[PDB]
């Protein structure tokens, strides 16, 4: 049994993987729902951090 | 009243194997699902703006007319009456560690009932049902 933890979870995941996950999960829904579910990882791949 | 008219037994010291199960926390009389119970409460307290007559109006018009009789000339804020009615009607089921007594008369005193290494016998008050027996 491995008691584990992942380093840099928010710093190494990618919204371009989440876009592909919502494209492969919603592989039978109508086209409007696939556009709706693909908008959010698109906005998360163009995020601009404000520096406090 | 269910605790004042209740006798206690004896505490035993030994292992207790608790199983986590979804139990009802508090005893009721008419356990209704919360959307049906909300429609019933709207038909009791706010009958003008109540909406579409559903099937819940039909199988509970006795309770509706009786509670509208008993709450006729009262001056309490109606949202307090809505939440006392939903405390009277709506169930509340949670995942608790139970061991040997899962009825809502025994879950309301579960902290004093048993522990991981002791068990207190309890004989609650009020009345019970033949299905549990």
């Amino acid at each position: 049994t491995v008691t584990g933890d992942n380093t840099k979870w928010n710093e190494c995941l990618n919204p371009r993987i989440f876009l592909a996950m919502t494209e492969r999960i919603t592989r039978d829904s109508p086209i409007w729902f696939r556009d709706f579910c693909s908008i959010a990882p698109v906005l998360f791949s163009n995020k601009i951090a404000r520096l406090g | 009243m269910r605790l004042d008219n209740a006798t206690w037994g004896r505490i035993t010291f030994g292992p207790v194997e608790r199983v986590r199960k979804r139990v009802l926390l508090n005893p009721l009389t008419k356990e209704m699902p919360p959307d049906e119970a909300s429609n019933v409460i709207m038909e009791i307290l706010f009958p003008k703006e109540a909406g579409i007559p559903r099937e819940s109006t039909w199988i509970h018009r006795e309770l509706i007319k009786e509670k509208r009789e008993k709450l006729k000339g009262t001056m309490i804020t109606p949202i307090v009456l809505a939440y006392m009615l939903e405390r009277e009607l709506v169930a509340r089921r949670r995942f608790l560690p139970v061991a040997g007594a899962t009825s809502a008369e025994f879950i309301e005193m579960l902290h004093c009932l048993q522990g991981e290494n002791w068990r207190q016998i309890y004989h609650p008050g009020g009345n019970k049902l033949t299905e549990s027996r």
Partner: protein, 51 residues
Amino acid sequence: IRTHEYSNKGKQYISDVTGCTMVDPTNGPLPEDNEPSAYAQLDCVLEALDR
């Protein structure tokens, strides 16, 4: 800085909508050491979702 540090081997470009310096680590090269890596392969993700 630490987010762009684990992704700087991917395709860096400039967005023509805003003007920002976008960085694309996905489908990039494989890691070479035990450093944190953001280059997630797409075919492995789609095969894991196939399983």
